[PDB]
Each structure stands twice: as C-alpha cells, then as structure tokens.
Amino acid sequence: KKYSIGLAIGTNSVGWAVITDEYKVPSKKFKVLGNTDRHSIKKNLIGALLFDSGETAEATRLKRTARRRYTRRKNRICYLQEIFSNEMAKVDDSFFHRLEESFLVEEDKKHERHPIFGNIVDEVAYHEKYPTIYHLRKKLVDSTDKADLRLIYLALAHMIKFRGHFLIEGDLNPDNSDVDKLFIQLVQTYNQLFEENPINASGVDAKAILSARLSKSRRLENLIAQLPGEKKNGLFGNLIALSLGLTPNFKSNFDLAEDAKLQLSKDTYDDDLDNLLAQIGDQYADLFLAAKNLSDAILLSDILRVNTEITKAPLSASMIKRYDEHHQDLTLLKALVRQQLPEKYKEIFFDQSKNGYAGYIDGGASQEEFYKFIKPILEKMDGTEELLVKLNREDLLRKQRTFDNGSIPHQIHLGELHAILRRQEDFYPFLKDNREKIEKILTFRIPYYVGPLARGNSRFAWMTRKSEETITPWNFEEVVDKGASAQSFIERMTNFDKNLPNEKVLPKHSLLYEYFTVYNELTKVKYVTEGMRKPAFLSGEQKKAIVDLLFKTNRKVTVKQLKEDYFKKIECFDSVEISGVEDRFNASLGTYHDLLKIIKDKDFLDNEENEDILEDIVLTLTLFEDREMIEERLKTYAHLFDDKVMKQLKRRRYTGWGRLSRKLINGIRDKQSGKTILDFLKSDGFANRNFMQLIHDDSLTFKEDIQKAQVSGQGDSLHEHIANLAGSPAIKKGILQTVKVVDELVKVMGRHKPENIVIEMAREKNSRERMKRIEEGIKELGSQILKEHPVENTQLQNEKLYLYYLQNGRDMYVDQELDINRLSDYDVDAIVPQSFLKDDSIDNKVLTRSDKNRGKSDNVPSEEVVKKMKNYWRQLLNAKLITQRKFDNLTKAERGGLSELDKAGFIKRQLVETRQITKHVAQILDSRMNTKYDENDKLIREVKVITLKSKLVSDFRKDFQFYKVREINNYHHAHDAYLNAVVGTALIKKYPKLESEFVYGDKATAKYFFYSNIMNFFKTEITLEIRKRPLIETNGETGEIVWDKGRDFATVRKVLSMPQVNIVKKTEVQTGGFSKESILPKRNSDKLIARKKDWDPKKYGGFDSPTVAYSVLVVAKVEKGKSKKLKSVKELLGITIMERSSFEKNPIDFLEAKGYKEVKKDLIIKLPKYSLFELENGRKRMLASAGELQKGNELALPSKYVNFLYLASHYELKGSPEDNEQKQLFVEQHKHYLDEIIEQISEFSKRVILADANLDKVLSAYNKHRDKPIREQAENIIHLFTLTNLGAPAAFKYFDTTIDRKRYTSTKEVLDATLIHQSITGLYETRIDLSQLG
RNA sequence: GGGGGCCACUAGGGACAGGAUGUUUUAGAGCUAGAAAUAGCAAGUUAAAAUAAGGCUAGUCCGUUAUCAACUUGAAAAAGUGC
DNA sequence: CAATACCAGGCCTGTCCCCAGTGGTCCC
DNA sequence: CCTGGTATTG
Ligand SMILES: [K+]
Ligand SMILES: [K+]
Ligand SMILES: [K+]
Ligand SMILES: [K+]
Ligand SMILES: [K+]
Ligand SMILES: [K+]
Ligand SMILES: [K+]
Ligand SMILES: [K+]
Ligand SMILES: [K+]
Ligand SMILES: [K+]
Ligand SMILES: [K+]
Ligand SMILES: [K+]
Ligand SMILES: [K+]
Ligand SMILES: [Mg+2]
Ligand SMILES: [Mg+2]
C-alpha cells in the first residue's frame, strides 16, 4: 500500500489530502469512541484544519512596557513623598492620607473630603486664587515669600509626575531663548562672510514672523518678503529654511556639481554638513552653526509663547495665557450668542450630547470636534472675526492639558522645579539638603541599555549589579554596572562567527574588517593590455600600491581612477581592460577616512603597532552610544591625542556588526605558510585565492581548523525550532499544525511512510505609513502638492491616488502634470510586464497618462522614456518616493533591457519555489521522514518532499475547468491540497530530472520554451501552430505510465465532487486581556467589574464585557427562591480569563462560590471556543462563548453549480475567444442552475441555518432582481453564501438589500445534543450524548 | 540546485528606556423664584488617584505572545490508544 | 426568551539586534 | 474590520 500526501499551508488553514497510485483518495472506517450508539464512521482521507490567526508579541510588549512606566511614575511620587514626610507631618499629619483617598466617596473616606487643606473655606480660597496648577507653579517660581509646604509639594509633584520628554541632550535656555537675537547673529555672520552683498534686516520683526503659528514654508515666505532683492531659494533663504525645519538644497548656493541637501532632523546631518564644509571650506561652518542655534530658538518659541524676561516660568506663563484668553473669548462668545442667536445658547452651553462648549468641557467632544461644530456658528454671526482667526490657528478656547503638550522638554519643567526649590529652600532646610535629590528624581531615567532592574525573576532582564542593594535614582551609577549592562545589551543579540562559533564578530566599521573586504574584492581583479598574452591577477605589490595610492586617499575608488591614477601613472599603460569590478569598487575604507579627518595623523593610522588601539576605539564607538561612557572608555588613550581630537572622537559613533571575527580574518594561521586569511588576501603568489577558496582549500589548514572549531550545542524541540524560524508567527503556527497533521496522517496509514509529500505555501495603520512616506518625500522634494491638494491617510488606500502623490502629481513616462479628478482616465502600468513578473505591488507599478507611452509592451520601458525621465526618477528615488529596485527596473533599458536569460529566469521563478521559509518546512518534514543512512553513510531518501508554487495548480484549475470559489465553503483548501499532490507526483514522474529543482535534498531560449511548456503533457492539444499529444503520457525511460487523459481527469472530478470532506476548526482556549479596556461610569448592573478590590462598581464604575477563556458544563443543584430549595440544573458557565486561575486551582470551591451545590466533579466538561455540537438532522453548532453559538455545518454545493458560478460571475485571463464563446454558451444554456442554486441554499438553510426572516428576505431579494444580467445575479449569489458559511454569522448584501446577521443568542440546546471531540484531522472522533447527563 | 562575503535598497520579527492625551470617582460652596415639576441666570479651562483583578519570588520584579480534541497511566512531565 | 442597535484604547519619541526579498559582484 | 457583550424594547 503506497500513497502520497498533499499539503496546502496557510495563515488560517492547513489543507491535507491522501492519494494513491491512481490519484484516488482512499476512504476508511474509523472507530468512534464515546457513549452513543455509533461505533464507527466512514471518512475520506481529505480535509482541512482551520484556526484563528497566530498573533505577534507586539501588543503584549506595549502593555508590559506601559505597566513598568506606571509603576515607576508611582515610585517617583513615592520618593518625593518620602522626602517630605517629617516636615509635612509637622504641618498637616493627614495631607498625604487625603491625597491617597481622593478617589473615594465621602462615605468611604476616613478623613475630611477637601484634599489640600481639609476645610471648605481654605479649599475654595485656594481654587479662587489658583484656578490652574500653572498659576501656583508660576507663583512659587516668581514670589519670594515663604509658602505653604502642601502647595510646594503639589507643584513639585505635578512637575515630576508629568515631566516631559528626553529627546534633547544637555541643558536648555543657553541664551538660545531669543529668536530676535539669534536671527541678528545669523545676519551678522552672513554679512561677515559676504561683505559685498549685505542684507538689510532693520525693521524686520523676526520674532513675530518666525514664531508665528504657521507652516514652515509660509513663515519662510513672510520673512523673505521683508527683504528686498532676496529670494527664498538664495543662500540666506536656504539658511532660514534650514532653521525652520525644511530640507533646503545648498547646491546652487555654492555652485556645487553635487547635491547638498540638509535637514537638522536627519541622522546624517553631522556628516552631511562635514561633507559640505569639505568643499567650500571651513569659513562657512560658523554660518551653519548660527543657523542651527536659530533653529533651536524657534523650536523653543513654539512652546514658550510668552516673554521670558517678566518671569522665570515661561511655560506656566504660557498656560496662564491660554487660560486668560479662554476666559475672555468665552465671555465674548457667550455675550455674542445671547445677543444674536438666543435660541442656540442652551444647545451650545448646556447640551453635553452636542459638540458645543458643554460637550467640549463636560462631554466627550475633542478640541477638533468642537472647532468643527462651532466654525459655522462663528461664521454665521458678526463680531467673530478674531475668534475665527484663533480658530483657524488652533488657538481658541484652549485647555492646558492637551494632546500637543508632548513637545515640552523635561529641561523646562526642571527649570521651574529648580526655581521653586531655590525660592523655598531659604525657609525649609530639608529642601536645601534634598534639592539635588529631587532634581534627580525628575531627571533620572533607566538607560535603555540597562533594561528592567530585576533580581533574577524577569525573562526580559539582562542587567548586572555592582553590589547587592536596592537601586534608587540617587545610587544608580554606583549599584548598576552600566558598562557590563550596556555590553550585555548588544552581546545577547548579536551573532557569533559561524566559522569560529566561540568568537565574537567584528564591528562593521572596524578598520581590520574594511581592509578585509577591500582586499577580498581587489584580489579577484584582472587586467589586459596589448603586449600581454592573457589577463593577469594583481600581485601583492600592485594591490598594496593601489590600496596606499587610491583607497587611502579617496572614500570611493572608481574604475576610471584605477585606470588613470594607477595603471597610467605607475604602469604607463594608455589602454587597459579591467574585469572583476564595474563602475567603482563596492568595498571602501570609510573608517580610515573618518579617523584621518578626526586625528589628522596618517602615519599613526598606517603604523601596524597601533592596530590594536584603533580596533578598541572603533569597538567603543560601536558598542556604546552614551557619550559619557564613550568618554570614560576612551580615557585610557587620552595621552595619545589632543583634547580637541578627543572631543571630535567621542562625538563620532558607529552602528552595526560584521559577519566574521577577528580571529578568522587575522588570527588563525596556515600551518606551513604561517599566514593569516588577510595575509593571503594581501598576497597569494599567482593564485589570488579569496575567502571561500582559502577556507575550502584542502592544501591549507584553515578548513580543518574551522571544522575542528565547530560545535552543535543542544538541539531544539520541534516547537522551539519553528519559533526560531524567520517568518510571521501566523505562518509559523500553520507550519506547526502541518507537521502535526502529517504525523497523524502517517499514524492513519499504519505507520507506513508515504512516497511523496507535496507542499504549497500561500503568499503573504498602514495608511499611516503611506501618509508618512508621502509627507517625507514631498517635504524632501520641496513640493507644495499637499498645500494645493490635502489628503487623509484613508484616501491613500486608493492605488491611483497613492501613485499620484508618490509621483509628485506627474506622469512617470512623460514630463507633464497629472490631474487628480482625471485619475479614472489614466493607466497603471507594470514596469516589467506582468506576463514575466507577477508583481502587483507599488514597487512594480507606475501611474501614467496612457500605457502606450511606455513604448513596446513586451519588455522594460524603452530607451527614449529612460533618457527623458531618468533625472526626474532620480529625484523621486532620493525622496524615497520610489525604491532602488523600482528605479533600476525603470532604467534597465539603458543596460540592455530584458535579456532572454531574464525572461527564462522569470518564467522559472513563476514555477520553482525559492522562499526560505518553504525550504525550512521542507527540511523539517524531510528530516522527520528520512532517518536511515546507506552503506556510504549518505541519507536514504524514502520520502520525497516536493515544493510547488500556487501558480501551477492555479493554471491547472483554470485550464481543465476545476474552478474554485472561496466564498462557497471551506473545501477549496482541501481541494488545493489534493491537486497539489496529484500535480506534484505526476510532474516528478514524467520528468525525473526535475527532482533537483522540486525535491528537497542535495540556451536561454531553450529553458524559456521548456519551462513555459513544462505542463503541456497534461493537455491533449497545445497551441503554441497546433500540436497534439497522445492520450496516454508515460515516462520516457522507465516506460511507466504517468497520466491517462481518458481516466485520470474523471478521477480528479470525482474527488472534487465528494461531499464528505473533513473540515475541522481548531478549538482554542481564549487568552489575552480580561475585558474591554474602557473604564465605564458607575451604573446599577452586575455586569460591571471592580477596577480595584474595594472599588464597588456601583459607586466608582469599572469594566464590563469580559472574555470567556473556556466554558464549563456544570451538573449540580442551585438554591431556588426565598426558601433556598435545591433544584437540579445543567448549564454552561463561562470561566473568564480573569477567573481561570482561581477556577483551576480548585474547581469545586470556585463553583460553590458561584452558587452551585453538589457538583458532579467527574461530569465537568471543559469546552473551549469552537467546540462542536451535533443536533438533529445533521445540524451542527460551534461554541462561540458561554451564551452564543456559531454555524457548524458546511454547504457541499455540487461541482456543476460551482463551475457555473465561476464562469457566470467572471471570476478571473479568459483565453481563446472561441473558448470564451463556448463558456458563455454553457452559461446561457444552464440558466436554470441559478434557481437550483437558490433551492440548494434554501434546503440547507431550513435544515441547518434556521434564520426564517433572513431566508425570506433573501428569497424576496432574489425574486426582485430576476431581470438583472446573469453576471450580476451570480456575483450576488456569491454573497448569498455568507448566510450558510461556517462560523460566526455575518451581515451581507444582495445587490442593494442588506441582510443583518442572525445570531444564536442561546446555548441551552447544546446541553442535550451530542458533543464531538475531533483529532487534528477529524478522522478520530469521540462523541458524547449530553442528554444522558443529569 | 544549496551556501558565503561585499555594495545598494526594501521588508518583516524581537527587546528595552521614555512622552502626551483619554477615561473613571472625588475636590473646585452655584444663585434666585417657587413647598415641589421646573424656570431665569451664573459658572466651566485645574487637581488627586487608578490605569488590566492582582502575585510572591518582594524586585524601582512579574501579570494580554507562543502552546492546547478526547481517553489511560500519570503529581505533572509526557508516553500510549482506534485497520 | 427574541430581535436590534451600539460598542470596542488608540496616538507619539529614541536605542539596538536578527532573518529575508530584489538587483548586482566575487567565490565554495 | 469582526464578532461577542450589553442595554432597550418587546
Ligand atoms: K468621612
Ligand atoms: K524679497
Ligand atoms: K471633552
Ligand atoms: K560596483
Ligand atoms: K553605537
Ligand atoms: K592629551
Ligand atoms: K484573540
Ligand atoms: K493564545
Ligand atoms: K550573494
Ligand atoms: K523595527
Ligand atoms: K464638582
Ligand atoms: K481539535
Ligand atoms: K517602538
Ligand atoms: Mg498596579
Ligand atoms: Mg489627566
């Protein structure tokens, strides 16, 4: 008995099928356990396992991190209160007790209900004097009088609890506070550099112009307009643009041939400015630095909207300004509405449901919703012009705690905190002694490179301690070893050398590593001249001379430089032909040039004696990012460099790690030659062996030492091995299920391993990423397209509009503008045509006026289009609006275009799976099947693991009319697996030489033709004129029959027509959050859940809507009525995720606490979600929850109706027009099928669905559109299957008629039905008649 | 076919340190006329505290991913069970 | 009970690692 | 978006 298995691995399904030699699917009798009368059942060996998507760990991580943050914010407050404890006890011995219970109702309060002062007079006085906390903050900052200790605590606690961001290093307000003064100093620097062309800046109000609430480009235009004879794209204009945050191009300003784009926010700005200064000189550095200072001042003026000389609390003063303008504008608006619109006053100021002022202050209306509600009201009235101006600048009736406060740096809150401490420490000595401690509380962060401050109970922690005691903000530097912790931060994540598994890899920017890469590339260069007989390698002397003459004087070394600066200057060749490098060398000595610029000592860099030292320095600059730790580590080399060079050195930082270790590159030595790898790279006679040749050469000891250094460690389990693969957690879940299915299937066939296993793997918020890409690309492009055409993120889900914005609103094949309102008339063309590369992504698509303008449609865009549009395309590439791959495919015509080898490769990639994840799956199955070795100790491959792409079976279905319709039922997954098995086994039987291409384990026109006509042996006639093939296809060598076109197609049709297919929905315990996160208001309802142990929801609100982890069948007695008479029951209890641990620790006590008595402990049945119950007439239900059910039946629609629906709905490449005519004629000859289909649905519904209202509405809707075209009626019949689909009921639409879901809101019936436990394939069942329990 | 280094991009997976809102109860004396239903007016911007119930290992730690048909022996781990 | 309609915690900054797809180049 | 929880209306 021989058989093969077909598998279809997806993100929510694994289809499986067992086939025989004749491509038939067996059927077996399977034992049925349980307590019903049924002892066995017939099963076809074909089915599909269904499961909910595997989820990533991201959400868990975000919630875990927010948890830690809440804990540490509490800890900060606790530190502060600990400092205040004794003196506060002297002033008011219950102040902190009133704060801690402020949330409680007065009934539950132990102290007086007014928090701050404990009596109503003082409380009311305080609030009248300080309506907002920022009033009190400013007062404590500016006043000199002794203040109440409780108010001081409240101010400092508000600052520490909401302390602002940490995006700016160093200190703030360093005289970069005034915009006028930094603008004046920029003008002074500029007029210093350009004495002949001075700028007249008198009468220019730079403060109001640059600090105005306007866009960057608008403020730039306003400022430039005040300077005659100066344009926004001039030098000064670009400097102002750089200060305002735009991305100016200083190229034309300095007549550069290269582009010099600068943005102060990019990571490359330091190196970009150093690059620019390398050309025009260093006299211009002062100018760009003055511009950076002005930028800092403008960013600060965005937050501090008040004069910084009337108060030392500009932030609190700005918040008070917000409050005062709110008060004035509210008074004005109230009066205006009283006078002009007296009937709308109650709606605006009293109705919380409306988005007026009442809903804005007391309801759920946001500032944006309020502005939208009140803008027409202001435009309708008179006197609302200033209010409207404030409204359009988003500065009307502002609150102080708002969504945009995230701009505030923590140095500002710190300035206010320090000021308060300096004022009040003159009166309270413990504030003088603890000033720096409190400052530390506010300013201390745990470094990202230290992680959780755990003590051996956190799987996330890596921090090591210098000593064993409690870590506080004030002793962190002394208790935590920041060095070892920062080192573990990187070393627990980076790879070791695969060749030497115990050796750490080198930093990516190590000097040694770049020497290695440069020599490895340079050692395979060849060259020819006239007198030479044959191309030659480069000798060691030539390589060293090229390194010292070119690679050590130029960041990049082009082939022209190699030809002219070496072969002409040294070798005196006027003509030389180079191979092994094109255009320029890919490797380079970047770090050498960085350190040469910083230290300016070439002899220091070239002296081998300093190698070690340099390797350590780069290591530091790679391993650490904190400039203080960098300084501490580099301190040991301070005697070698000047303090200025030490400063520039500690400023420079690198990222990334290599693939090879130092011991591999320059450590181990060949036994006989005594040379390292890098030594051979520098010189290896006339062989010039590179890295692979060296480590694979049997005449050297490198290979043997690599083999000896190898270790294996502990092997992972199956689950561990799958978890460590590179792939989505969803597809990994599918892979694990696939392996479990194959294990069961082997167990079903009597532990007989199959001949072949054929596997096919499916292909694999976002609008925010689209909006971000467009914003960044357009602001980098300098375009005003978003000014003239505003767009929201959701709108970018339209392909044509997304392309339009990515192309700056221009045609991509013609240099012309495109119209938005004309997008429906334009074309979306594939760069490389989809007949070769089936790529439908934005990476291979282009919006154009007409695809005709591409040139010829059989290849890449023509050369003329490339010549026209290459510069515009390069602009789009630099703005990251198109990718490097998109640009390269767009420009391939100037490189020869598509060659025939490329077309052959594309057609091959369409059929041969090359994704790594599928290789890993194939390897897993292969290593689990084949385990024995032959006489040569080579693996014995009993089971051949074949991998196919979906296109083979897709084309098979489309060519032989085995169509799929996904919406009808879930059988198409199983059918895909069956067809996979059939096609894969037949293909490898017909052409055995293809095993290397399709089986796991170890001229262009010819291969193009061959791989295009690889599937033709299935066909009877092929049109490529017309050729015909025999009825019986056999193997050419063995003579074995592989396909009988008269019999096997019938077999496939019978297999696809079988109604009995094992569809199994994986039952899963529910996990995750306890309930909806929403904190609901108090309500008289037992559905509310307490947010804390003592917070009765009827007084404090709380949560509702918990998630049931799994239900539990309980058979017990419950007390009934006032008598408490015991009454037997049988019901489902939903154990919530929050209740699960308490229930599982002791079920009987849990159930008795819920009210049940005398629980039959052995009749407690655990029922996860999707548990299957069979009722009458084959009706099945699945458990959605403890009180709801899902549809549990499949509608096995006959094959003729499936193919009719496919053809009539025009589901998919029609083919020959004569075959299209035949298909249309078949559609029109079988119109009655429509009615029959409805009938088939109806009989199913009345038997299984039981939705009388919905079914009647659907029948009426079908009888309403009987005159519609057949195509549309079929398209909507497709929608009709939502009523019968397995699973949760969903709404659907038949034409314009909407059918709402019919829900099954009671689980009472399944308590007397038959529970069914299914194995992973569903072949093994256990059936329990619940009606016998009671 | 499988594999490796380098260059240019792109894409996804994992971890850590932080920010601003939101929500919930309470505090921020509502006034007047009517016994009240209510009517007229005044006012509104802020704060505390919680932010999965909680756990013991008591850390400035852990608490939402992955994994799970049934049954036997099993403490569980796990293995075994149907031609 | 049965049907019906409404609801849902998102947003943001920074540091770092890994595998893997595309196009190239040199090798095992 | 889905789909299970919830209050309202019967
Ligand atoms: K009290
Ligand atoms: K001007
Ligand atoms: K609001
Ligand atoms: K190159
Ligand atoms: K670094
Ligand atoms: K020095
Ligand atoms: K879930
Ligand atoms: K789970
Ligand atoms: K490669
Ligand atoms: K990432
Ligand atoms: K109140
Ligand atoms: K199952
Ligand atoms: K993040
Ligand atoms: Mg907590
Ligand atoms: Mg708040």
Side-chain angles (χ1 to χ4, degrees), chain A residues 494-509:
Chain A
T494 55
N495 283 143
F496 290 83
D497 193 325
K498 297 207 193 309
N499 308 109
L500 302 181
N502 274 1
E503 293 287 323
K504 310 167 185 176
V505 300
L506 282 167
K508 182 66 172 227
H509 300 95

Side-chain angles (χ1 to χ4, degrees), chain A residues 874-931:
Chain A
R874 160 140 292 105
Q875 287 163 224
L876 289 188
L877 168 66
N878 296 339
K880 287 188 169 180
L881 295 171
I882 73 167
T883 60
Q884 179 75 37
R885 183 217 190 195
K886 187 165 186 178
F887 173 83
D888 285 338
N889 286 334
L890 275 166
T891 55
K892 202 181 182 66
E894 72 186 351
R895 291 179 272 106
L898 282 180
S899 63
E900 213 62 28
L901 186 62
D902 300 335
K903 304 181 189 175
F906 287 151
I907 285 207
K908 195 198 185 192
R909 295 174 185 276
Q910 288 182 13
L911 308 180
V912 177
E913 185 68 283
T914 56
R915 286 144 63 202
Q916 205 69 13
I917 191 67
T918 62
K919 299 172 182 289
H920 291 307
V921 171
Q923 182 277 327
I924 293 172
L925 284 178
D926 178 89
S927 65
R928 282 178 73 87
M929 299 303 299
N930 312 308
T931 60

Side-chain angles (χ1 to χ4, degrees), chain A residues 306-366:
Chain A
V306 78
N307 190 35
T308 70
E309 300 171 3
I310 58 181
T311 175
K312 280 196 57 184
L315 177 78
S316 297
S318 308
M319 298 290 100
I320 294 167
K321 178 193 185 184
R322 280 192 190 180
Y323 180 87
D324 294 329
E325 294 186 12
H326 190 138
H327 184 86
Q328 297 159 9
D329 298 354
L330 182 60
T331 297
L332 174 59
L333 180 60
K334 282 182 188 174
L336 282 173
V337 174
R338 286 286 188 191
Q339 185 171 2
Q340 307 191 24
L341 299 181
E343 65 282 336
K344 288 185 181 181
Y345 188 96
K346 184 182 178 181
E347 180 188 357
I348 294 173
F349 296 104
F350 277 85
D351 202 321
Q352 303 188 18
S353 178
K354 297 299 296 177
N355 288 13
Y357 190 77
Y360 173 60
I361 301 294
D362 297 318
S366 67

